[PDB]
């Protein structure tokens, strides 16, 4: 039962073209008429944003289901959520949200069913604009180190509170982004990885003593000869070794440097770069330390193991590595955790479903295998000394379960510790299945399909498909309240496509969708839409596609290549200028997956799919005269420092020019708009802000797909 779609005439605002900007890339001339949009501070760019906001508001005013979606999302997400607890000393800590708090509150308890005490409430600062990203509790549970944002930048300030009375220490550590705070077992301070004072280059590893100014922090590592190398760090569970991981770019590969803290004459004060044991000193493979017994370390690695494995090495004999748990021939070893003193919990991904294995740490022998339902297990935080492991399970139809596995007393049983419940939602009316569909080259692409049980496969249903496809990221079918609104009140079918470029089948899956093979990602996604149409879930023009960042690139490339397949396209903070992405903020870190236009071979890949360079009028191709672009919403925060908004702005300007304003009477009737969030960064928006964005997104989609509300 179709509704009316977009019909009001659109007044696209004037956008100036700089016709003089032309670059030569290895003999190919590329015009960049919206180069000036790369300056966010100019009056012309600010005017562009104001004008696009005005246009978007006029279009969204005609989407009459926005208010209905908004209230239903609010109602469906209005349930208490307890994060996975973790233990320090004899205290437990976790995040909590009563349902509609702007941000999660960090709580402490004396026991798992004892009275929670609020340690830090981000809702009290700036209306909960930002939540906590860095949170770290000392070994004695006396101190809590956490990161606060000051303004809309990605820079974090680390503060420390005493858990006993919630009083702040005077200590303030600036120039941090994503660093952890890694405590020594003496409780005297912590390792962290700041950048030098005034860009994010020349990252350092430092140690901060409690009660001192940042200027007194001990330098452990820097490398002025490699300014773009970035750092992660870790301390072993016994407190004896500090591990520094050095990474280059976005690749899953790192060095491993090991510092023996017990051999230092006067502790870390001895360094008032330090003498690291350079166990791995190349970028050939990934290595994450799982456990050690003295100098004998157990690592997870992808070395000669695209699906990963566990290996063991003695630091005293560092050339000799031995497999502990061999690489599986089919399943990805996603993570491993030492627990209950002498065991390992392994999280495998087997055809995009989790399987947990409990193994003996010393021998690697399998003890128990726990297959998990469709969804995702994550947040295993238990340490080697802990006998009880907690983790979180979520799925499309399961809002959130915190499971407990007591390895001492009842190791085969997952016990429910906390269970979230969606109000006024009957899970049993819906189902999720996994199917495998062929890509253009024959490759099996897993997809998850969620819908009401017993629907007719008559092509009548609106369909939303989501994907990412890059950077070895695994796309799991997790819970979204807005997705349930779509299924229930729009009679929708939801599809999550596990396309190449992700990590789901290991490094070979990732490499089959990066660099020269990035086009495979788009073909995979297109093939999934074709399957949904051929099998009768939906029809072309009732399919909506959505993705963010690298997934926004996915959306923009697919609508350029196959505009006929889609009725709605929503690209959140997409990477749209593939020739220039490497020049802005941290875009240079992505050249591993994408390539870079400064090399001819790589330019040739990039130009073929770069969204702003491939906008073409589909109706000018013979036999395609009835085709237009789908209704398109480009979403971005106005101060996204991860993916700069110029990408979105240049695509928007290019689409509006090619399809609408360069012609006096264009066949393009579907609107091409941007929803620009004012005063927002990349990082985690407050509950109501996020709900407002998602309601706008679904209202626009409902109108674009001509899908009526049910209820």
């Amino acid at each position: 039962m179709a509704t009316s779609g977009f019909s009001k005439p659109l007044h696209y605002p004037p956008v100036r073209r700089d016709e003089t900007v032309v670059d030569d890339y290895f003999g190919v001339k590329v015009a960049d008429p919206y180069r000036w949009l790369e300056d966010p501070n100019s009056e012309e760019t600010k005017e562009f944003v104001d004008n696009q906001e005005k246009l978007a508001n006029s279009v969204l005013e005609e989407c009459e289901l926005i208010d209905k979606f908004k209230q239903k999302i609010i109602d469906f997400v209005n349930f208490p959520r307890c994060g996975v607890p973790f233990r320090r000393a004899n205290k437990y800590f976790h995040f909590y949200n009563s349902g509609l708090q702007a941000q999660n509150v960090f709580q402490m308890q004396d026991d798992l069913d004892g009275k929670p005490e609020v340690l830090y409430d981000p809702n009290l600062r700036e209306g909960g604009r930002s939540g906590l990203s860095l949170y770290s509790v000392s070994e004695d549970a006396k101190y809590f180190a956490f990161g606060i944002h000051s303004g809309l930048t990605e820079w974090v300030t680390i503060k420390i509170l005493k858990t006993e009375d919630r009083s702040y220490l005077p200590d303030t550590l600036e120039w941090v982004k994503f660093s952890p705070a890694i405590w020594t077992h003496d409780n005297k301070g912590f390792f962290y990885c700041p950048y030098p004072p005034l860009s994010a280059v020349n990252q350092e590893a430092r140690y901060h003593f409690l009660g001192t100014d940042q200027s007194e922090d001990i330098l452990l590592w820097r490398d002025l000869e490699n300014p773009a190398h970035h750092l992660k760090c870790q301390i072993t569970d016994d407190g004896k070794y500090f591990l520094l991981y050095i990474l280059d770019g976005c690749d899953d590969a790192n060095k491993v440097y090991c510092l023996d803290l017990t051999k230092l004459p006067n502790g870390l004060e001895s360094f008032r770069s330090a003498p690291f044991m350079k166990l791995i000193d190349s970028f050939d493979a990934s290595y994450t330390a799982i456990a050690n017994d003295g100098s004998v370390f157990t690592f997870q690695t992808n070395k000669d193991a695209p699906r990963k494995k566990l290996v063991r090495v003695d630091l005293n004999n560092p050339s000799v590595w031995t497999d502990l748990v061999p690489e599986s021939k089919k399943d990805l070893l996603e993570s491993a955790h030492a627990v209950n003193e002498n065991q390992l919990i392994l999280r495998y991904l087997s055809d995009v479903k989790h399987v947990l294995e409990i193994r003996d740490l010393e021998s690697g022998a399998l003890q128990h295998r726990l297959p998990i339902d469709i969804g995702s297990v994550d947040g295993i935080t238990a340490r080697r000394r802990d006998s009880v492991v907690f983790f979180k399970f979520t799925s499309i139809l399961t809002p959130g379960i915190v499971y407990q596995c007591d390895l001492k007393n009842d190791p085969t049983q997952l016990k429910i510790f906390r269970e979230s419940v969606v109000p006024d939602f009957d899970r049993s009316e819906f189902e999720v299945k996994q199917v495998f569909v062929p890509s253009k080259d024959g490759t099996k692409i897993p997809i998850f399909i969620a819908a009401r049980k017993g629907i007719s496969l008559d092509g009548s249903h609106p369909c939303e498909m989501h994907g990412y496809g890059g950077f070895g990221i695994n796309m799991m079918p997790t819970f979204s309240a807005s997705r349930i609104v779509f299924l229930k009140h729009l009679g929708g079918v939801f599809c999550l496509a596990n396309i190449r470029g992700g990590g789901e089948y290991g490094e070979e899956w990732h490499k089959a969708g990066f660099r020269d093979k990035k086009q495979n990602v788009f073909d995979d996604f297109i093939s999934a839409a074709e399957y949904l149409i051929s099998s009768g879930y939906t029809k072309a023009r009732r399919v909506a596609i959505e993705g963010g960042a690298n997934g926004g690139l996915l959306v923009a490339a697919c609508i350029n290549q196959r505009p006929d397949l889609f009725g709605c396209a929503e690209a959140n903070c997409g990477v749209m200028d593939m020739l220039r992405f490497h020049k802005f903020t941290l875009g240079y870190l992505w050249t591993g997956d994408y390539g870079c236009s400064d090399k001819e071979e790589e330019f040739k890949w990039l130009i073929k799919y770069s969204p702003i360079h491939n906008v073409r009028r589909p109706w000018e191709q013979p036999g395609n005269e009835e085709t237009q672009y789908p209704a398109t919403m480009i979403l971005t925060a106005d101060h996204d420092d991860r993916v700069v908004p110029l990408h979105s702005f240049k695509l928007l300007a290019t689409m509006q020019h090619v399809l609408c304003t360069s012609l006096e009477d264009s066949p393009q009737k579907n609107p091409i708009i941007a929803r620009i969030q004012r005063k927002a960064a990349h990082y985690g928006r407050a509950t109501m802000t996020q709900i407002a964005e998602v309601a706008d997104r679904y209202g626009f989609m409902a109108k674009a797909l001509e899908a009526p509300w049910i209820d």
């Binding site: 999302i73 997400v77 959520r81 994060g83 995040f95 949200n97 349902g99 509609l100 708090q101 702007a102 941000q103 999660n104 909960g128 939540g131 906590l132 990203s133 860095l134 949170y135 770290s136 982004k177 994503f178 952890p180 705070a181 970035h230 990474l247 770019g249 976005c250 935080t381 979520t394 959130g400 890059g470 950077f471 990221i473 997790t478 819970f479 979204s480 309240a481 807005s482 963010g548 960042a549 690298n550 997934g551 690139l553 959140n572 903070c573 990477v575 941290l586 875009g587 870190l589 992505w590 991860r642 993916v643 990349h682 985690g684 928006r685 407050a686 509950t687 996020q690 709900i691 998602v694």
Partner: peptide, 18 residues
């Protein structure tokens, strides 16, 4: 504990599974 995937072009301790 600190933010994962930090170098990558990706979006999403989220306040709510919206």
């Amino acid at each position: 504990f600190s933010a994962s995937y930090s170098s990558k072009p990706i979006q999403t301790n989220a306040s709510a599974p919206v």
